[PDB]
Symmetry: C2
Subunit: 157 residues, 2 copies
């Protein structure tokens, strides 16, 4: 059972979905994320190309790899912001960006913000010649998919 | 655009690997130490997707497999010199693939062409491994090899 963070967002060339469910065990365990046991949940950003999309060379629905996704969580009533750096990984349902998360401020309603930066210049390229290449270019400022009334009430599993 | 084959597609481990070549291309940013569109002899690409075995790693069968480290080796028949070319991930009008603008340094002739495909770097990718939501497969330790022993560089076909 997966639970949605909110409705899917279309931002620039991306269709972005946000879900959460029980914490998972990952190998290798990424960055500084809490273990399956220490975490509150696992949050995932499902990012696929949309129609806009095709200008960068992607097929509609294709997973968009090499992105740098970071989530910002801020509890309503608090000025504290928790930053969570997602990591690319596979679950049984395919590649996505995700992280085990522990809500530092606890139960409550949160504003949840995904900032999605394009691949680093030395991490990806585009053919740009007329014969083989593409018309679109990667975005400069990270794209945003935001939900401002996400209710964290404890595990739903 | 016109693509020319390097040889027969290969199935190795959980990957289906195709190799093609065509005119040199202009890339943005210009990847690593790859020759420019003018300096190059051609552009070579490795089209890598998951096969049925890849399903155990969590990939959709037939889908692109990102974060791999693909390196090509070219060696002219009758020569001891080997060229090592690091491929970069990139998009063309037909989608993501790994590739490079390349010079065939020993000129026209038959070359052995070998693509060695390593799994993502330890800090570049992960797998869910819990029973509930994870996968039962794992990344390969020894790089996979797709190779063609008799590739004919007969010059530009453009
Ligand atoms: Cl915020
Ligand atoms: Cl490594
Ligand atoms: Zn490992
Ligand atoms: Zn995940
Ligand atoms: Zn640029
Ligand atoms: Zn150079
Ligand atoms: Zn492909
Ligand atoms: Zn020979
Ligand atoms: Zn191609
Ligand atoms: Zn290419």
């Amino acid at each position: 059972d997966e639970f949605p963070i909110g409705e899917d967002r279309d931002v620039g060339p991306l269709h972005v979905g946000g879900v959460y469910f029980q914490p998972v065990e990952m190998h290798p365990a990424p960055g500084a994320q809490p273990s399956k046991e220490e975490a509150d949940c696992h949050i995932e950003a499902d990012i696929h190309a949309n129609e806009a999309g095709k200008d960068l060379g992607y097929g509609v629905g294709d997973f968009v790899p090499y992105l740098r996704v970071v989530a910002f969580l801020q509890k309503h009533g608090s000025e504290k912001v928790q930053k969570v750096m997602f990591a690319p990984m596979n679950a049984g349902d395919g590649p996505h960006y995700g992280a085990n998360v522990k809500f530092e401020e606890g139960l409550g309603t949160y504003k949840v913000r995904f900032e999605i930066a394009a691949p680093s210049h030395d991490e990806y390229s585009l053919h740009i010649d007329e014969q083989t290449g593409v018309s679109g270019r990667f975005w400069s400022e990270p794209l945003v998919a935001e939900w401002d009334d996400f209710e964290w009430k404890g595990p739903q599993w």
